[PDB]
Amino acid sequence: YKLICYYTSWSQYREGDGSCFPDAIDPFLCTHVIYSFANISNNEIDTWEWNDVTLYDTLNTLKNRNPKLKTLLSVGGWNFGPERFSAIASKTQSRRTFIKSVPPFLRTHGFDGLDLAWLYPGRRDKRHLTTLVKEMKAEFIREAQAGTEQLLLSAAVSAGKIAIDRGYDIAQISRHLDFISLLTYDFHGAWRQTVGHHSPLFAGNEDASSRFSNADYAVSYMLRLGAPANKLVMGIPTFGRSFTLASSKTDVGAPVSGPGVPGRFTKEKGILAYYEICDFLHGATTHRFRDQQVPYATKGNQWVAYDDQESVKNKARYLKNRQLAGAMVWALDLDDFRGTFCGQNLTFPLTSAVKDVLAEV
Numbered sequence: 001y002k003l004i005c006y007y008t009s010w011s012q013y014r015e016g017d018g019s020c021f022p023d024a025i026d027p028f029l030c031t032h033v034i035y036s037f038a039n040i041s042n043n044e045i046d047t048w049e050w051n052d053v054t055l056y057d058t059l060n061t062l063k064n065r066n067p068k069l070k071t072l073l074s075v076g077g078w079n080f081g082p083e084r085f086s087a088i089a090s091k092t093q094s095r096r097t098f099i100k101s102v103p104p105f106l107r108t109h110g111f112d113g114l115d116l117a118w119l120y121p122g123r124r125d126k127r128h129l130t131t132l133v134k135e136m137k138a139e140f141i142r143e144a145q146a147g148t149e150q151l152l153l154s155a156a157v158s159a160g161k162i163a164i165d166r167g168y169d170i171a172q173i174s175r176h177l178d179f180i181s182l183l184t185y186d187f188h189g190a191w192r193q194t195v196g197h198h199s200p201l202f203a204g205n206e207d208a209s210s211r212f213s214n215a216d217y218a219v220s221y222m223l224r225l226g227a228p229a230n231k232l233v234m235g236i237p238t239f240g241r242s243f244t245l246a247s248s249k250t251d252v253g254a255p256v257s258g259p260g261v262p263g264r265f266t267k268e269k270g271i272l273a274y275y276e277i278c279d280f281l282h283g284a285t286t287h288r289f290r291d292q293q294v295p296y297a298t299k300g301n302q303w304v305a306y307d308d309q310e311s312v313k314n315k316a317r318y319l320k321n322r323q324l325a326g327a328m329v330w331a332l333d334l335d336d337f338r339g340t341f342c343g344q345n346l347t348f349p350l351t352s353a354v355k356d357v358l359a360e361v
């Protein structure tokens, strides 16, 4: 099984213990580690942060301890305008220029592949995305003639039915990608004025109309559309989504006023790292959706949807049962990487729980 793990560059800036650098990563935890995110300048792949060249080197030295470890550099991301990807892929000339700049950059910095994080292609982009993937892969095939191991090509893809139907030719890109990571943790949050879980595994016979907004539906749908199970990787989150309640009601459908209060370390309204959730739990009431198989907690007027060791193990078993290629984790820097916030002295408790299940078979 593959265990794909993302590391985000901006996590180096969090204060105190929240600060995470590539060397905090256990070389034997994941099979693949993806660095997020690279930029595109003058239609060529480029660094993003001032010290990326140094962090690339730090990350890639983990391979001196685990020679089987593979690293990839992810291009795009949320702070990368989707329109920007749009413009590059739409024109043969700018697309060729970008594709050509990739292999030498990857080789120079010691990466084993490129991850595409175009979030997200729209109806008018579907054809160009296919073109981008095909031609990128052909270039990688060509570059390997030089005697070096062929570069890997992956992509992070929406798990939302409407997003999938609108922007992706799944049957086509599946044949050119080495693996596809499903973003199965964005099924709510988004700004909708009700309380709900962003990463449920199953639909849950209760208050539903989404009926498409759960991991099981997304996986089934991808398989139906033509993606082979052996190229599909299921996304598992290591963060939680928070809400400020509008009333004293805590159960399903409870009214919400806006996102939750920022965490001390991550400092972003609406999100909390798992290590911050471990702290938040002291004094909170914990619950679990029996149908969706995911937990949530409340304290004061704060409501948090998250994943714990039990739900993450549950998701890992599910993907093994569907015979998928593996799991993807977003993100290592949001897991209890120091192993000092969540109690039982274990570094990366969530990611380790997934790895354990995956190693059972």
Ligand SMILES: *[C@@H]1O[C@H](CO)[C@@H](O[C@@H]2O[C@H](CO)[C@@H](O[C@@H]3O[C@H](CO[C@@]4(O)O[C@H](CO)[C@@H](O)[C@H](O)[C@@H]4O)[C@@H](O)[C@H](O[C@]4(O)O[C@H](CO)[C@@H](O)[C@H](O)[C@@H]4O)[C@@H]3O)[C@H](O)[C@H]2NC(C)=O)[C@H](O)[C@H]1NC(C)=O
Binding pocket: 039, 040, 041, 042, 047, 048, 049
């Ligand atoms: C990821 O990559 C993107 C895309 O490459 C980076 O975005 C660009 O960032 C640069 C640096 O801040 C910046 O380019 C500069 O633009 C100057 C003028 O600004 C306009 O830029 O913006 C309006 C937009 O509507 C245009 O209509 C105008 O024509 C300009 O283009 C431009 O003057 C400046 O060019 C200087 O070139 O710099 C040289 C050398 O210092 C100087 O001698 C020249 O006289 C000149 O003034 C420069 O090119 C721009 O704002 C961003 N543009 C784009 C394409 O988005 C992004 O920074 C990067 N991200 C990260 C985090 O690295």
